[PDB]
Amino acid sequence: GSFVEMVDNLRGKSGQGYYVEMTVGSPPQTLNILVDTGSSNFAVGAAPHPFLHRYYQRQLSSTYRDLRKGVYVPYTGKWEGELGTDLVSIPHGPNVTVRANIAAITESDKFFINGSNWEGILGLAYAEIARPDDSLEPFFDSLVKQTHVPNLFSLQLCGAASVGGSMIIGGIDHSLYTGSLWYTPIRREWYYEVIIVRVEINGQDLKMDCKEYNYDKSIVDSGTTNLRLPKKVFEAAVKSIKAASSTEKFPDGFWLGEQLVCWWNIFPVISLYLMGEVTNQSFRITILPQQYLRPVEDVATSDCYKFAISQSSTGTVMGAVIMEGFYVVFDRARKRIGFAVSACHVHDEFRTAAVEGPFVTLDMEDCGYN
Ligand SMILES: C[C@@]1(c2cc(NC(=O)c3cnc(OCF)cn3)ccc2F)C[C@@H](C(F)(F)F)SC(N)=N1
Numbered sequence: 001g002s003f004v005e006m007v008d009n010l011r012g013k014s015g016q017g018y019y020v021e022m023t024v025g026s027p028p029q030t031l032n033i034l035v036d037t038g039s040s041n042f043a044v045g046a047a048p049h050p051f052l053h054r055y056y057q058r059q060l061s062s063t064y065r066d067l068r069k070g071v072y073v074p075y076t077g078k079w080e081g082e083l084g085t086d087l088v089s090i091p092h093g094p095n096v097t098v099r100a101n102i103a104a105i106t107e108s109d110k111f112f113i114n115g116s117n118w119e120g121i122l123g124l125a126y127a128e129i130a131r132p133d134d135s136l137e138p139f140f141d142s143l144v145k146q147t148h149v150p151n152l153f154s155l156q157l158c159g160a161a162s163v164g165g166s167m168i169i170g171g172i173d174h175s176l177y178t179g180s181l182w183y184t185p186i187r188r189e190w191y192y193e194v195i196i197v198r199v200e201i202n203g204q205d206l207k208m209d210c211k212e213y214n215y216d217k218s219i220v221d222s223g224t225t226n227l228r229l230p231k232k233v234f235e236a237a238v239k240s241i242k243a244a245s246s247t248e249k250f251p252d253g254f255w256l257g258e259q260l261v262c263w264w265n266i267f268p269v270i271s272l273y274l275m276g277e278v279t280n281q282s283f284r285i286t287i288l289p290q291q292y293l294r295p296v297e298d299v300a301t302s303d304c305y306k307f308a309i310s311q312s313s314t315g316t317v318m319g320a321v322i323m324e325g326f327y328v329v330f331d332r333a334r335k336r337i338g339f340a341v342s343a344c345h346v347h348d349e350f351r352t353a354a355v356e357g358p359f360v361t362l363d364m365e366d367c368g369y370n
């Protein structure tokens with residue numbers, strides 16, 4: 001209900017993600033760690049990459065144990081490291097110390113951000129996508145196995161430049177949201193996979209076969225900035241967003257994220273309906289242009305914004321563009337994810353982000369890709 005010591009334990013800069021302070025080893029080494037519900041490894045800088053403020057020094061730790069195994073993790077950047085275990089704690093988190101797997105990062109490319117204040121990543125998703133395989137127990141799994149911390153965590157990510165928010169570990173803080181929580185099932189415990197059953201732009205249904213909304217999956221990912229949509233869905237959404245915002249024209253490159261525009265009510269709300277807890281029942285989460293038109297503050301050659309909805313080949317990714325609207329409860333114990341209106345979300349006098357239900361939606365199981 002109330003975890004005041006964990007409130008406001010997240011920091012970041014716009015476009016660089018949200019991080020939490022952790023300690024690794026004995027005596028404790030303080031590191032800032034990106035909170036990532038889209039991956040499953042605890043991986044920290046362990047060598048003096050010039051972009052890093054701090055890094056894990058295994059030689060200074062008496063509780064370090066070598067697993068004598070390496071791991072190589074390419075993405076569409078990359079990183080490589082050495083697997084071990086050590087004692088891990090979260091200063092503005094529950095009062096516990098856990099022995100966790102750590103990938104000591106020894107080489108990387110396009111992974112760390114030049115100018116950011118974090119030097120590792122906390123993968124909070126499930127073992128099935130852990131590298132090199134599902135035998136490497138993710139951090140949160142170790143946390144639950146070794147303590148009486150309940151098997152859930154919740155995230156309030158606050159946008160718009162410093163950002164902040166809260167990671168409530170083992171519970172929910174009711175001051176972080178307004179109205180009620182609405183829950184969608186976690187379809188499979190790998191990513192935080194969910195099913196989208198309907199899409200509306202300013203209340204107008206896109207009218208697509210709902211399978212296309214989830215081709216080939218839909219996930220909830222704090223480690224991605226954009227709302228990413230499958231190519232066909234993105235196509236249809238931009239078309240509809242263009243129509244709704246017709247009073248001004250804009251170049252095609254802007255909608256494709258290939259150029260910024262410099263200059264809210266011009267733009268429509270976007271609603272995703274998610275599978276509910278009950279047969280034939282759904283609910284709707286709604287975001288504003290405040291969430292999906294993101295300011296780009298680092299423009300030396302210019303008040304510019306990037307269109308932060310983009311096309312994807314890996315499915316829908318509900319990134320920061322979605323999560324900044326909402327308090328999001330990752331209720332692992334019950335295989336579900338709760339959304340509520342965030343008490344910190346950016347909005348105006350006319351429109352607010354919303355979570356509403358129940359709605360009647362048939363054939364919701366058919367929306368999943370197999
Ligand atoms: C592990 C990986 C990854 C994420 C990031 N994330 C950011 O830099 C970032 C920036 N801003 C954000 O919000 C706005 F503030 C959020 N997150 C960086 C490196 C990285 F490796 C992999 C990423 C993937 F796309 F390569 F798969 S996605 C993914 N889920 N995890």
